[PDB]
Amino acid sequence: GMTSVKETKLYDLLGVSPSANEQELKKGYRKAALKYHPDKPTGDTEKFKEISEAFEILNDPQKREIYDQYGLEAARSGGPSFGP
């Protein structure tokens, strides 16, 4: 895909590189899931879900763009949902 995003963290959340292929995503996902697994004492469930969400944002041109423009918080919210 096109890396039209602000941060390449989306790839880091999948444990893959910008030009990663499907095989990379699968193996990286297991690595990332092993990294942000809720078994970790901090209990990062949001980060575990963020793994999939990152790919979903990266795989979706709408949220991909929103990520570039505003960032992850906006992209994951489906837009600049930042009220006063």
Side-chain angles (χ1 to χ4, degrees):
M2 291 180 56
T3 307
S4 312
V5 292
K6 186 180 186 64
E7 310 171 291
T8 37
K9 206 199 78 175
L10 294 173
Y11 298 101
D12 182 85
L13 288 178
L14 279 304
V16 300
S17 312
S19 299
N21 288 89
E22 178 182 59
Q23 289 183 89
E24 289 292 294
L25 275 305
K26 293 180 175 184
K27 64 180 74 172
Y29 183 91
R30 302 181 311 223
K31 179 181 60 177
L34 182 61
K35 180 179 177 61
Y36 300 105
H37 65 142
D39 308 88
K40 190 161 66 74
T42 48
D44 292 277
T45 309
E46 56 176 83
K47 302 298 289 291
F48 182 88
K49 295 184 178 181
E50 200 179 304
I51 302 173
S52 180
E53 182 162 64
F55 179 73
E56 292 171 64
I57 293 175
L58 196 284
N59 183 86
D60 172 63
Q62 290 175 269
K63 294 183 290 297
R64 182 189 299 166
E65 177 184 84
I66 301 171
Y67 198 111
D68 177 86
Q69 297 174 149
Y70 305 98
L72 182 148
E73 294 178 89
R76 79 195 318 184
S77 303
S81 191
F82 302 102

